Amino acid sequence: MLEGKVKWFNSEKGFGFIEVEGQDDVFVHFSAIQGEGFKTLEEGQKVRFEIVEGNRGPQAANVTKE
Ligand SMILES: [Mg+2]
C-alpha cells in the first residue's frame, strides 16, 4: 500500500485527488473509501491506498485513513 495526503476533496460531490511526492496526483472517488459511516475525505488527511489502472486510466482504490 502506497502513502499519500489528500490534495483536495469535494465532500458533497464525493471526489478529489491524492498527492504522493515524486509521482502524479491520483484521482479518488468516494467509492474507493474503506470503513464504516459517511464515505468522505478532508484536505491534508494522510491515506493508505492502491493505484488501480484499467482502460479508463489510473485511480485510487482501497483508501483508508486509519
Ligand atoms: Mg497502478
Side-chain angles (χ1 to χ4, degrees), residues 1-12 14-66:
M1 294 279 167
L2 265 357
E3 104 188 280
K5 271 207 294 243
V6 174
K7 194 163 180 189
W8 60 272
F9 193 91
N10 190 331
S11 177
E12 287 183 67
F15 72 96
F17 287 84
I18 295 160
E19 308 191 88
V20 22
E21 194 179 334
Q23 254 209 51
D24 284 321
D25 289 8
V26 179
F27 179 83
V28 52
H29 185 249
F30 66 79
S31 64
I33 304 164
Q34 311 304 291
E36 71 207 301
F38 193 67
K39 297 189 180 325
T40 200
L41 293 170
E42 241 77 22
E43 221 180 283
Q45 175 146 55
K46 297 216 197 168
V47 294
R48 230 57 214 190
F49 73 107
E50 284 168 345
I51 301 166
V52 182
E53 179 173 12
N55 58 12
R56 282 179 84 171
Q59 63 168 335
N62 299 317
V63 178
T64 61
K65 321 131 172 217
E66 303 101 58

